[model samples]
Target chain A: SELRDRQAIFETLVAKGRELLACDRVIVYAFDDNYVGTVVAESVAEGWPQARDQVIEDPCFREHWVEAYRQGRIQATTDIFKAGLTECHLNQLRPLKVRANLVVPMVIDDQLFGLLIAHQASEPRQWQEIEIDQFSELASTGSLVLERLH
Target chain B: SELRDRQAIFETLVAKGRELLACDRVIVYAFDDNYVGTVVAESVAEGWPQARDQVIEDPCFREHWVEAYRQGRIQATTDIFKAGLTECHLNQLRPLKVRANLVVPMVIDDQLFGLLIAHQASEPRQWQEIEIDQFSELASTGSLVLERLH
Candidate 1:
């Protein structure tokens, strides 16, 4: 029942996130203690790229964004091509066919739990402040749900 | 089983829409031939206005957006106040606490079926073009799903 409840919660999170963000795709990435990430839940618009169940192993990710996430940082960009993202970062997204993206930290009790990500597959998209705030609110609620399950 | 299938599909539509758009609320409005509308399905973020199971009897809506939807039009606005909407239209939205809105027609078999709506409640929002496209795509898929169910 615990696993089922968690699945239902995460599924609803991604589904609701995808609709509210109006992006090509939305995903929840759960991070292990070592900062390794796995795509736990995903909602992809038809004909868009999918990344469900994919494990993302980025050695540089922990040193860069984990601490920022711990501090409740949000990363949003309309266009990755001009966002000054490193080549390595761009390469990571290339296979996913992401053009624009927004990522918000899902923090629970001062710990960085994971990330709620929105992706624009075919074109650059301006991530509005309200959209970001909405995603953050979802992540906050998601944290509470996860806490209760644990 | 058929009823369950329809419920499941609509639930997924609203859930995915709320997530992808990152809006405060997402709803599906079913319209009758006379243009009477009912909230068929809704996904709302926490602390936002709830309009589930509400009946909307907007006399002016048919003259304005209903015809547009029939013509496969999509209406999107970042700031409702600055969108040049009529006072009557603004009045209808004000009570619902909508700050920004995006509406897409769900056309089935070349007929205007209903509408898929996204709303921002707390603040004015800039709805990106990609976001609008995403919503439109969702409505399109929703049309297909409804058609199959029928």
Candidate 2:
């Protein structure tokens, strides 16, 4: 209903989704035409998790990450160590200690809008429909706001 | 849908509604809560028409004109010579040479937001159903955009 008041809307999503999903962290990453990554919004349990604005580039990037967008896939990783991901991806995620993760590709009208990732650092988790629905809604709203910002 | 491309949406509307209404001019007026006006987009005639930014200061510009929104009235006319109108209302129309007019109010969330004005300078007219339908669609689209801007 509101693609206007973008920041207000985004903040609402982060707050409500965090409370509903009972997750330790929720982070929204937005992308531009050049695939440059920026952390648009984040909600995290204080002192429990740590994350930084990391550019999407060669060293920290992974084959699955590229394939997710390239092939338009949504990923769920309960155990990062056993997900068959490359050492580079594991090394990059080490600092955040994101043992459980769920990410949905924000693809609308054939464009990779961005990504929504939620995590519980020390626990094994299954991605639920409620979480998927909330993330999807947030992604669509993000796409609308991003289009306006352009 | 119209939401895909803003420019295309505006242009398509001007072509469809202006041609069907057979009016001298058609202008979309959008207003914010502060009453700051924005002619986000406009469509004019082929011949020389008044500048689009002409300020509206007619005496009939009372808050009651916003009633069409609350009542969901599809169309309204401001005929200077029409019966039951006050001298002040008629005098307001005289200066503008508005022989007849239709103001379709765009309402969102039970509030008067903006208007779609179809104007004729020399003829007294009533809008047909087709015209009313087109105006309603255009107004709805305008309201959606306004909601985003809010």
Candidate 3:
């Protein structure tokens, strides 16, 4: 019942987000004990990769981003290519065909549960402050809902 | 942290149910250890009684209804006066001015968390099967979300 309930709420906002953001896809990237990330939940539009059961092992994400996220950071990138990402550091977005993305952390009981992500795959585009605000609201609301089940 | 998160989600569907059901009021009736019910969360329409903080101690409700509800019962009352309750046992509906009501149980971790109630305060309402069906779905989904925090 514990896992069943967790999976239920995890999928709730993962689907709700794509419809609200109108993005090509949205996903929940859950972190494991060793800081390994897994694609546990996703909502994808047509013609894009279906993201689930995908394991993410990014040393850079662990080394650099995890701390900031734990402190409640809101990560937004307008253009992955233009963001001056390192040539080799595609940051896992390249595999997902992400041009722009918004990443909101889901914290439970003062701990990071995972991430609520909205992905734009077609092209690089600047996300409006309004869009960022809306997405973060969902993330916060989703986090609050998810926390109770833990 | 545990109590904070539980209260957050307890309020989530308490409001959502009112919006979807569009009833006069919707409430979360939480049962204490002694089977005393308390209105912990409420969403009330204008000009109606604010239902929060009300306490209910119905012996007949405990004696007659609690076990059936534990077995996953859905209680729908079209009219309280006509329902033929004991003159002594108004079932506490009189004080609340409840003309009709639909009660759905929220079972978390295989135990009854409490009751999710829709109250038609203006007049007697013959709740549709569809309405009953819809409310129960919300109760189930809400229960799933609430279970995780526990």
Candidate 4:
């Protein structure tokens, strides 16, 4: 029953995120102290890549992204390739076939916990500020949970 | 700082629970699906028996107590031995040298998560209604945290 409740909570988060954003994929990526990340929860459209349980270790994560997220930066890009992201960044997403992405940092008490990511796999899509804001709100809710669990 | 905040949140719960109840020990006991419980967080006065990390699996829990807790019953007693508790229940507390106990269910979204327990170890103690109410408030706050973490 405890396990069921836990799954229900994260499933609710991922499902709500995908529904609200109309994205091909939504994932809750959790980070460890060494900055290694894992796809802890996800909701993906049919035929899209499934990355649940995938462990990500991108060195550029710490060098280029961690500080921005710590300061509450939201990365909303219509096209990953054309977004001026460093090749290292694009390299990390291209293998997953990511074309567009909206990434929000889950921060709790001023610490960066992880990313709430919305992926557009089939096309390059423009994202609205409202969409980003709504996603941020979901990430904020997730942060509260992650803080205690972590 | 993130680690500090995490510790502060749970530490505050136990600390406030002990201070408000004026008890020798206050603990946040988390329950598993099997109704087995663990002392997840605690505040204990010097010379008191430490109950942290204790795993309590009282067989009578489901038959005698779980439903009432799920129904939001607050078990605040002046004397555990004479509180009409079963022998099994008294046996569990007697070993801890507990004379009185105040337990409030940590319920979140109508699910029984765990408990907030105050122990009067040295002597039998009458728990005031006001103390029980205050303890319940702390448990409510704990529920919010538990809901996310669970």
Best by DockQ: 3
Query: Each candidate's chain A: what TM-score?
Result: 0.93, 0.73, 0.92, 0.86
- Candidate 3 Cα errors over 4 Å, as ranges: A1-8, A11-50, A53-150
Residue-level lDDT of model 4, residues A16-110, one tens digit each, is: 78988888999888789989999988999998788888999977668788988887888777887776788777777866779988988877667
Candidate that beats the other on TM-score, 2 or 4, i.e. the better one: 4
Docking quality category of candidate 2 according to DockQ thresholds? incorrect
Q: Across residues A1-150, which tens digit of lDDT does each residue of candidate 1 receive?
A: 555555666777787788787889899998898989999889998986789999999876588777878888888889899978799878889989999999888887678888889999989998887788767867765675455444
lDDT of 1 by residue, B25-142 (tens): 8888888878888888899988867888888877765777766777778777788888788988787777678988888888777777778899998788888877876667667655
Q: Residue B5: error of model 4 in Å?
A: 18
Error of 4 at B89 (Å): 45
**DockQ-based ranking, best first?**
3, 2, 4, 1
| Model 1 residue B79 lDDT score | 85
In terms of docking quality, how is candidate 1 classified? incorrect
Model 4 misplaced regions, further than 4 Å:
A1-8, A148-150, B1-150
User: Against the native chain B, what TM-score does each candidate's chain B reach?
Assistant: 0.89, 0.66, 0.92, 0.85
- For each candidate, what's the DockQ? 0.04, 0.06, 0.17, 0.04
Q: Which stretches of model 2 miss by more than 4 angstroms?
A: A1-9, A32-36, A56-72, A145-150, B1-150
Could you give me the TM-score of model 1 versus the true structure?
Answer: 0.51
lDDT of 4 by residue, B10-125 (tens): 66678767866678999877778888898878999999778888999975556688888988898778887777788877777777789988888977778787788899998889
Interface Cα RMSD, each model:
10.6, 9.1, 6.0, 8.5
Worst 10 residues of 2 chain A by lDDT: A55-64
Cα-based TM-score, every candidate: 0.51, 0.44, 0.57, 0.49
